[PDB]
Design goal:
Two copies of one chain form a homodimer. With 144 residues, chain A is mainly beta. The first copy, chain A, has one domain: Chalcone isomerase (3-Layer(bba) Sandwich). In chain A, 12% of the residues lie in helices and 38% in strands. The first copy, chain A, has helices at 39-47, 120-127, and strands spanning 19-26, 31-37, 58-69, 72-89, 100-106, 111-112. A six-stranded antiparallel β-sheet of chain A has the order 1-2-3-4-5-6. In chain A, a hairpin with a 4-residue loop joins strand 5 (100-106) and strand 6 (111-112). Chain A binds chain B through residues 16-20, 22-29, 32-34, 36, 62, 64, 66, 69, 71-72, 74-78, 80-81, 84, 107-110, 129-130, 133, 137-139, 141-144, and chain B through 16-20, 22-28, 32-34, 36, 62, 64, 66, 69, 71-72, 74-81, 107-110, 126, 129-130, 137-139, 141-144. Bound molecules: fe (iii) ion (2 copies). Chains A, B: This is Cytochrome P460. Chains A, B: Residues 12-138 form the Cytochrome P460 domain. Chains A, B: Keywords: Heme, Iron, Metal-binding, Signal. Chains A, B: It comes from Methylococcus capsulatus (strain ATCC 33009 / NCIMB 11132 / Bath).
Chain lengths: 144, 144
C-alpha cells in the first residue's frame, strides 16, 4: 500500500475504476489529464451540486506526459504516468484548506508529494483562483 | 432512444459510466477525447489481452471540441460534444470489417452516422493502418 500523504490522507483505493468527469490538456506542462471521481462526486457533477460539492466527493486527476502516436502523428496520446492528484471534500475536517483535503502521489512508484503537512498551501495558491467554484476548476464534460 | 447505426449496431446503454482506457488529443481536429470501455474491454486492456481483443469488448471514444479554461488559459478543456465512436469486437459477426463492428453517433442529438450499411469501410480505411494491433490505435494508459 502506498504511504499516506503528509497531511494524513491515504490513497483512495479503487480510483482507477471510477467514472469519468472530464479530460484536459495542460499546454504549459505537456500533459494529458483524465479527471475521475467517486460516485458521490460523479452524481454531484452530473446534477450540478457543486456549490459546494458534497462531503465525501473525491476527485482525481491523472496526468501523463504527452507523446505522439507512432501510427498517427497528429494524435497526442499518454506516455509516462506522472502523478495522481486528489481532492477529498470534507467541509468540517479540511475547513482550513477550503473544505478539501489535497494529496498528490507521484509516478508508478506513487511517492507521496510534499515536504510536510502544509504542502497543501501550494495547491490552494492556485486553486483559490477557483474559489467561486468551490476551488474546483474542472467543468464536467457534456454528454447526452 | 437513438436510432441504431446503419449496420444494425445499437447504442450501448450506460457507456458514460464505463471505466477509462485512455485519453487523447487530435491536433488536426482541435478535439479532446476520452477512450472508455466496457468491463470486458477494460479487463483486456489492463491484462494486455489485445492480440486480439476478446469478443464482447466494446471501446468508446468520446470527442469534444477543445476550449480554454476561462480561469487558466493554458488548460484546454472540453467544450461542445461532437461524437461517440464505438468499436464492438465480434470476430465472427463482424468478420468483414476486421472482427470489429464500427458505429458513430453525432452530437448531443445522437444522430447515427453513415450513408448506408457500408459506412464502416471508411473507418477501416484508417483503422487498417493499425492491423498489427487488431485495428485499435489506442494504447491503454499506464496506471499504477
Ligand atoms: Fe490542481
Ligand atoms: Fe477511429
Amino acid at each position: 500500500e502506498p504511504a499516506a500523504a503528509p497531511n494524513g490522507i491515504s490513497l483512495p483505493a479503487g480510483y482507477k475504476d471510477w467514472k469519468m468527469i472530464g479530460v484536459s490538456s495542460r499546454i504549459e506542462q505537456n500533459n494529458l489529464r483524465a479527471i475521475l471521481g467517486n460516485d458521490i462526486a460523479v452524481k454531484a457533477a452530473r446534477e450540478g451540486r457543486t456549490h459546494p460539492w458534497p462531503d465525501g466527493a473525491i476527485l482525481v486527476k491523472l496526468s501523463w506526459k504527452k507523446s505522439t502516436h507512432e501510427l498517427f502523428p497528429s494524435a497526442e496520446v499518454p506516455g509516462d504516468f506522472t502523478q495522481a492528484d486528489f481532492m477529498v471534500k470534507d467541509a468540517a475536517k479540511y475547513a482550513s484548506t477550503g473544505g478539501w483535503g489535497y494529496a498528490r502521489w507521484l509516478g508508478m512508484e506513487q511517492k507521496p508529494y510534499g515536504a510536510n503537512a502544509d504542502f497543501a498551501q501550494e495547491c490552494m495558491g492556485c486553486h483559490s483562483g477557483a474559489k467561486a467554484a468551490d476551488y474546483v476548476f474542472t467543468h464536467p464534460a457534456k454528454l447526452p
